[PDB]
Amino acid sequence: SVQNMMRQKEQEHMIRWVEKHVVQSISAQQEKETIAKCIADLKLLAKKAQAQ
Amino acid sequence: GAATGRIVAVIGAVVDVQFDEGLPPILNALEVQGRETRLVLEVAQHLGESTVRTIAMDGTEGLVRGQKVLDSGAPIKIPVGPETLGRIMNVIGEPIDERGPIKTKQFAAIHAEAPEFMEMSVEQEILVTGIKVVDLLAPYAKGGKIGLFGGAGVGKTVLIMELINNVAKAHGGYSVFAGVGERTREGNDLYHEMIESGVINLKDATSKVALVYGQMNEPPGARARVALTGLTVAEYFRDQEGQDVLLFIDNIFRFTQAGSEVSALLGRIPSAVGYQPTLATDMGTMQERITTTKKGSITSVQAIYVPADDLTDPAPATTFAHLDATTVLSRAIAELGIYPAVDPLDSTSRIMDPNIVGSEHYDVARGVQKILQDYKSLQDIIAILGMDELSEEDKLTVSRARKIQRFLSQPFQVAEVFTGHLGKLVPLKETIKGFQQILAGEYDHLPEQAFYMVGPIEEAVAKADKLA
Amino acid sequence: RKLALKAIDWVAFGEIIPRNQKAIANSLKSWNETLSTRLAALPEKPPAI
Amino acid sequence: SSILEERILGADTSVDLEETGRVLSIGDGIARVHGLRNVQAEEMVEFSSGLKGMSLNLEPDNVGVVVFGNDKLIKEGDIVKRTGAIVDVPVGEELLGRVVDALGNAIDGKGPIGSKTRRRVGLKAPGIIPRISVREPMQTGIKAVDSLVPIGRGQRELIIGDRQTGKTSIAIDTIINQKRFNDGTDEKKKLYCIYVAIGQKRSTVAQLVKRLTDADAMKYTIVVSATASDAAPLQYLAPYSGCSMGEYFRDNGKHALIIYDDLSKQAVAYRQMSLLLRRPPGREAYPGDVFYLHSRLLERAAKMNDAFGGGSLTALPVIETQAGDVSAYIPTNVISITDGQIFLETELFYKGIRPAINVGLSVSRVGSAAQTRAMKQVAGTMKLELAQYREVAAFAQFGSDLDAATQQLLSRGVRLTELLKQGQYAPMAIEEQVAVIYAGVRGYLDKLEPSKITKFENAFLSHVISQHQALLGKIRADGKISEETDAKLKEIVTNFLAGFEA
Amino acid sequence: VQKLFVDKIREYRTKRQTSGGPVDAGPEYQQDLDRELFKLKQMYGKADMNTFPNFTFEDPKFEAVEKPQS
Ligand SMILES: Nc1ncnc2c1ncn2[C@@H]1O[C@H](COP(=O)(O)OP(=O)(O)OP(=O)(O)O)[C@@H](O)[C@H]1O
Ligand SMILES: Nc1ncnc2c1ncn2[C@@H]1O[C@H](COP(=O)(O)OP(=O)(O)O)[C@@H](O)[C@H]1O
Ligand SMILES: [Mg+2]
Ligand SMILES: [Mg+2]
């Protein structure tokens, strides 16, 4: 009952560390966003093609 | 300055306000600019095309249309911490004791969710109080909700001034009191009776109780939210400090009476006898946070009002599913003089059980309800015909169940100033022993005026010794 | 499973007839009833480790 | 840790065009949505934050939507999406031994339930051809129920009464008592159970899973739970979801049982949810179709014929009434859907009859009288000997003396009344019931005292399970109490009565 | 969003570089894991690591019955 409770307190902290650190890492990028837009065009170009 | 708004319509305590960009999410706070005091508006609805409808915490007189309104960014937050003890607050958490500000390191929002399923604690015990009607027939627990149902003028707060005088003295952890919609001179005599008796310490940090107050002079957007304020100062002392806190609420009906006074003006069709359509979802969101959990333990005692002496009214009769113990008081009992006027037939528990309360106690419990029911089931015949047309066995559940009714009335400690009689505390083991000597039939020669308003059973034979 | 049987001895065993010693047998069978099934759930073996 | 990383590589980030309706208002749970052209009625719509909802009203301008959750993350101007499915819950035997919420997500924390098939909450009751009559018994282990008011398998029986009289305990001794069939060998004597908790606080439902796990009762039940903190469209959806896990069993062969605790809290979740949609109130502000609300529920409790599977689905709806008045609006609408009732009172509970069953009024369409063969012998005569008692035993004031005439019959009732009392969470068997009922009606107790029969019972019952195990196995196997089996029991009661009190 | 698929694994590997439990506990994780470690022992009991059961039981003393007879 001590082995399980110290796993639970450790588990929630491990999740929030990966989660709160990715907020600044996605915010800082400025060159890959232009890469991200052309694939977002190509996904929409792929998206309307399967409809009609 | 996230957003700026202008008052558009004002009906009583439901101010309408139009924004232009940046609509506030529901249950934010809005700050009305251009007043002498603080006026905080809390968003309730979203009426379409950039317009919200709010409920105000203080008075709305003197507002004009176009008057600016500013957006906070967060709900009503209050300062919480260990410096809150010995201080009185209001609905928005400002010191109304005129002793200066409350300086804590953290702040707690008024609105938070409920605990999950897997954070509940099932362990039950018995909290012995010192009252015969509650120890014998309907024992309280250590970590469970308690209700005290009663009309107007029966004793729901003299009974709650005893469970402070007997439990909050011998408690080791902290304590929290809340006043929701009851009168203000009674909220003054709890300050000048906890300063005198060492519970409030004005000079250093050795105080035990916190206080939170919204009384029966406020607008009904304040009485509907003062009960979620004392409920938040009694959660920091549970989850983040880890104590064993009491919580006394009087009165919790006015959370609901003053919620059907602002529900007509929000645009809602009414349900039965006049109440709001959402009577029993807002109650199950306030009561689902007052719990014992795996991180602490709150021992609730709530006083509940029944309107016009009716227990089938929708506001009392939906509180019953949220309790553990129950102490239904009565009016016609208290016309006889039996005080505390507890109904022995209507009061329950979940720990009255032969394995928990002990198999000797459980048989004096169920065996004294059996003799009490059989006195009720002959009141048709005794009232019309007479006592003198009964058998000889049923003149011995009548004379033994009038010695038992009188031996449930106890003089309280808080009631010495009324009648001039010493308040008596009995222990648990001297009530079980003292009712087995009325059920077996050892005192069948003593009169019934000797079992009345005495403490332990040896005073009954002493009062019988006096009259001769 | 170390356990003993007995004979049917309930009828006249309270009729021991001492010098007015009715409580000697009326307490004797009273110990006999509770001790029987309770020591049966002791006598055989302990459960798995 | 390897568990978090393997959960994130299995995630599918699929993207497609939705169908989308801007929000125009949000207050008290109702979200009038502009847009949403091709939406169905009763379709499940999904808000942006992760919430879920069901579009009830269709209208030319707006579309009324109620929320399964909380309405404070939703702001005017949001986005409502289209799933494309009328509202459905998972189903199977894989939910067995869990506590789940009203849409099939686990609130116990043992993990994701692995379920494969999904079944609607709005399906239809079967008609006239695929049923059959009620052949089998359903044993509760209560002795006032099994002898006097029996309940077949496939019969809707209503437990009605006040608050704090025994309505939950009656339906939890029934959950416990089927432990003996579920570890047995035949697949047609089992009874898989289901409990639906509506409007109950979590410090009662997390405490009932404790009482159902020391006795190992939880290995064959499911608990669908919609607490009092939930959204009012989640207390409305709960019995239609719990009843649809019952019909995995019944539509595949087995036998199920379902308790609605209670159904006076599935009505005030319909009164509130459908007043804020601007629907005009009826009586006591209830809607027009509260009778249609309960009736389309309580008719799925079928008993199929043997060319479909032969499975059954009992139902035990609980109803709380105010001040013991049975002529209210929601009581009388559900008395006249169920085959029989069990009237629990308060003056029975307090005088001492516990379980407090009014055996005078607890009528039952007997279910083709599938009591059982041996209980018919001893409780056939018991039913008449108790009925003879109740006509004549209500004076409390005596003046004349007729011991040869009346006082013999009323001495047979108090020996059979105090026999009928029981404890709590210790339910008997049927052949342990035939033995103790044999000794009451055959005159073998009129020389006791009535204050000693509850003491006489446990000393008798411990003697027969210990010393007479091969006796009771011929009642359970052969069904009937045979004439040579009548012979062997004639000594055992009298041999024990010769040495009971000594 | 496989560009987000790589970016939550790569900042999970940074969490796998650990020395003493929490990375940013400070006074937070040290107080909470010590408050919870008491509560699994407070209402539970005082128990050491390996101590066996040490006790002793005494049975009922068999008294005799005096009986002048015949
Ligand atoms: N067989 C029994 N004999 C004696 N007492 C019982 C028995 N069954 C239950 N009780 C007691 O009666 C009380 C009420 O039982 P129960 O909680 O089932 O009532 P209820 O009407 O379901 O309560 P609620 O009104 O909260 O739903 C409990 O304290 C329980 O211990
Ligand atoms: N234990 C008691 N002994 C004597 N009188 C009592 C007792 N309890 C209540 N009373 C009387 O009943 C009244 C109850 O009013 P109070 O308890 O103050 O508020 P409420 O109207 O909410 O009950 C008291 O003023 C007192 O006169
Ligand atoms: Mg008062
Ligand atoms: Mg119940």
TrEMBL record, chain A:
<comment type="similarity">
    <text>Belongs to the eukaryotic ATPase B chain family.</text>
</comment>
<protein>
    <recommendedName>
        <fullName>ATP synthase subunit b</fullName>
    </recommendedName>
</protein>
<comment type="subunit">
    <text>F-type ATPases have 2 components, CF(1) - the catalytic core - and CF(0) - the membrane proton channel. CF(1) and CF(0) have multiple subunits.</text>
</comment>
<comment type="subunit">
    <text>Component of the ATP synthase complex composed at least of ATP5F1A/subunit alpha, ATP5F1B/subunit beta, ATP5MC1/subunit c (homooctomer), MT-ATP6/subunit a, MT-ATP8/subunit 8, ATP5ME/subunit e, ATP5MF/subunit f, ATP5MG/subunit g, ATP5MK/subunit k, ATP5MJ/subunit j, ATP5F1C/subunit gamma, ATP5F1D/subunit delta, ATP5F1E/subunit epsilon, ATP5PF/subunit F6, ATP5PB/subunit b, ATP5PD/subunit d, ATP5PO/subunit OSCP.</text>
</comment>
<comment type="function">
    <text>Subunit b, of the mitochondrial membrane ATP synthase complex (F(1)F(0) ATP synthase or Complex V) that produces ATP from ADP in the presence of a proton gradient across the membrane which is generated by electron transport complexes of the respiratory chain. ATP synthase complex consist of a soluble F(1) head domain - the catalytic core - and a membrane F(1) domain - the membrane proton channel. These two domains are linked by a central stalk rotating inside the F(1) region and a stationary peripheral stalk.</text>
</comment>
UniProtKB/TrEMBL annotation, chain B:
<keyword id="KW-0067">ATP-binding</keyword>
<keyword id="KW-0813">Transport</keyword>
<keyword id="KW-0479">Metal-binding</keyword>
<feature type="binding site">
    <location>
        <position position="155"/>
    </location>
    <ligand>
        <name>ADP 2</name>
    </ligand>
</feature>
<dbReference type="GO" id="GO:0045259">
    <property type="term" value="C:proton-transporting ATP synthase complex"/>
</dbReference>
<feature type="binding site">
    <location>
        <position position="153"/>
    </location>
    <ligand>
        <name>ADP 1</name>
    </ligand>
</feature>
<feature type="domain" description="AAA+ ATPase">
    <location>
        <begin position="142"/>
        <end position="326"/>
    </location>
</feature>
<feature type="binding site">
    <location>
        <position position="157"/>
    </location>
    <ligand>
        <name>Mg(2+) 2</name>
    </ligand>
</feature>
<dbReference type="GO" id="GO:0005739">
    <property type="term" value="C:mitochondrion"/>
</dbReference>
<feature type="binding site">
    <location>
        <position position="155"/>
    </location>
    <ligand>
        <name>ADP 1</name>
    </ligand>
</feature>
<dbReference type="GO" id="GO:0046933">
    <property type="term" value="F:proton-transporting ATP synthase activity, rotational mechanism"/>
</dbReference>
<keyword id="KW-0472">Membrane</keyword>
<keyword id="KW-1278">Translocase</keyword>
<feature type="binding site">
    <location>
        <position position="158"/>
    </location>
    <ligand>
        <name>ADP 1</name>
    </ligand>
</feature>
<feature type="binding site">
    <location>
        <position position="157"/>
    </location>
    <ligand>
        <name>Mg(2+) 1</name>
    </ligand>
</feature>
Automatic annotation (TrEMBL), chain C:
<protein>
    <submittedName>
        <fullName>ATP synthase peripheral stalk subunit d</fullName>
    </submittedName>
</protein>
<comment type="similarity">
    <text>Belongs to the ATPase d subunit family.</text>
</comment>
